[PDB]
């Protein structure tokens, strides 16, 4: 049986990451991908290879999906992993990036991993146990009105007037600019609500366990519901202010830029 | 008295307001000032009142300008002055209990010789002392890598600017994030993580660490015109990387500029 067995694992393969990395960036190269700002680096693929490697020796029949490698692709014991999701700020800050691992037995999310590796704390959730950071449980948050909450998306891909009806309806604004960590805010309370317009599947592929056991909201633009295997335009969504940010969302005729 | 006797009384209560504000924050209540979301906190007052409380118990002749008290008395002809935002990012405080900081800094004749930025919630506190340099925890930090605007992140608050050269700024700039703490945001353009962090309307107390990190670290820090910026009083503010500087003026004043209305 246990998850916890495999997760024990899991966390030691995260401590043997943790002396690894400074290696990785002692060497450090980057490369663009499709356009200027869409960056890879050796630290991104050799977290890849790696745990593509754990995963052979310890889990042979275990598939992994992830953005560093091609995909194909009905599938049993599946992971889903973004070896670092907030790249671009790995590169101009050495800061706010993370791990983002997922596991799935027949469709349904068992673990779920999200690392902030610059501040040292670890994100787990357990279906079964709950979700943890650093050990310490971690609680439904209480509701957040849109009013009261801050939120966070990227405005450089929404028209300004859906970004504005935002602005006027929120607390106020931030953003750390990695879905992982974004989203994990949303799951300590400290954000109302994460936004991302044209996610990957690794983007977002921890959050499911993490929603689904702190009670939160995670569905397409569409209040739909989001298929692990393909991505989707996703928001990770305190329950009390759900209805509220796809409402606005979808008004006016949408949020896609121009106009 | 050396400097560095002052600053080693000064990073020590700094250090000791680490055991006070866990339990400010367990008791957090909460009052609004000039509307309902300009906020202030039990920690915010406490953290003020024990500094000054401190600075007369140590230097009784100095004089603290700062933000939740009055500052009347002045004016430009003050030997020994220090400015203070006790908590500086009190929405992120309220909400988050993450990315606020304490802003700190010496003015002796007008001229800065010790400047804080303590970023409590990791624990980072930022230091520099005139004649020996500017650190992070005593980890000493230099000037930062040359960045040009469209290689950099930058920092800055969408809301009060329109929508036009927000979006000029956007496309101009590798990204855009934003910490929502002015010493913060400011010290990631010290740390060379953003090129630069713009604040439209910052009281003495949101830039006055500032402008010593700026003067050692080679940034750039003046008026959204290009002037020197006066410690007594506010302004339009930009702090910056100095290859991406005059690029983001340019693109703040084009058009009519960046207010709301042009
Ligand atoms: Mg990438
Ligand atoms: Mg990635
Ligand atoms: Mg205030
Ligand atoms: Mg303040
Ligand atoms: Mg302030």
Same mark, same amino acid.
């Given at each position: 049986?246990?998850?916890?067995?495999?997760? +024990?694992?899991?966390?030691?393969?995260?401590?043997?990451?943790? #002396?690894?990395?400074?290696?990785?960036?002692?060497?450090?190269?980057?490369?663009?991908?499709?356009?200027?700002?869409?960056?890879?680096?050796?630290?991104?693929?050799?977290?890849?290879?790696? =745990?593509?490697?754990?995963?052979?020796?310890? =889990?042979?029949?275990?598939?992994?999906?992830?953005?560093?490698?091609?995909?194909?692709?009905? %599938?049993?014991?599946?992971?889903?992993?973004?070896?670092?999701?907030?790249?671009?700020?790995?590169?101009?800050?050495?800061?706010?990036?993370? %791990?983002?691992?997922?596991?799935?037995?027949?469709?349904?999310?068992?673990?779920?991993?999200?690392?902030?590796?610059?501040?040292?704390?670890?994100?787990?959730?357990?279906? &079964?146990?709950?979700?943890?950071?650093?050990? %310490?449980?971690?609680?439904?948050?209480?509701?957040?009105?849109?009013?009261?909450?801050?939120?966070?998306?990227?405005?450089?891909?929404?028209?300004?007037?859906?970004?504005?009806?935002?602005?006027?309806?929120? =607390?106020?604004?931030?953003?750390?600019?990695?879905?992982?960590?974004?989203?994990?805010?949303?799951?300590?309370?400290?954000?109302?609500?994460?936004?991302?317009?044209?996610?990957?599947?690794?983007?977002?592929?921890?959050?499911?366990?993490?929603?689904?056991?702190?009670?939160? +909201?995670?569905?397409?633009?569409?209040?739909?519901?989001?298929?692990?295997?393909?991505?989707?335009?996703?928001?990770?969504?305190?329950?009390?202010?759900?209805?509220?940010?796809?409402? %606005?969302? #979808?008004?006016? &005729?949408?949020?896609?830029?121009?106009?």
């Amino acid at each position: 049986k246990t998850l916890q067995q495999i997760d +024990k694992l899991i966390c030691s393969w995260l401590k043997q990451i943790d #002396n690894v990395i400074p290696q990785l960036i002692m060497e450090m190269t980057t490369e663009t991908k499709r356009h200027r700002f869409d960056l890879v680096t050796n630290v991104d693929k050799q977290i890849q290879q790696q =745990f593509q490697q754990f995963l052979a020796t310890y =889990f042979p029949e275990h598939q992994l999906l992830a953005e560093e490698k091609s995909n194909a692709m009905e %599938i049993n014991h599946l992971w889903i992993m973004d070896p670092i999701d907030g790249t671009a700020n790995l590169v101009k800050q050495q800061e706010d990036y993370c %791990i983002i691992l997922a596991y799935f037995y027949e469709g349904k999310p068992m673990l779920s991993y999200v690392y902030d590796y610059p501040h040292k704390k670890l994100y787990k959730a357990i279906r &079964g146990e709950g979700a943890f950071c650093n050990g %310490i449980k971690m609680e439904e948050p209480p509701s957040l009105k849109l009013e009261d909450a801050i939120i966070s998306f990227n405005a450089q891909v929404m028209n300004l007037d859906t970004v504005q009806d935002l602005f006027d309806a929120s =607390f106020s604004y931030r953003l750390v600019g990695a879905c992982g960590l974004d989203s994990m805010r949303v799951a300590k309370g400290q954000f109302g609500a994460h936004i991302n317009t044209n996610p990957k599947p690794w983007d977002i592929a921890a959050q499911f366990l993490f929603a689904e056991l702190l009670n939160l +909201k995670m569905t397409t633009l569409d209040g739909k519901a989001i298929d692990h295997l393909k991505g989707a335009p996703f928001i990770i969504s305190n329950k009390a202010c759900h209805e509220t940010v796809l409402k %606005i969302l #979808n008004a006016n &005729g949408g949020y896609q830029k121009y106009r």
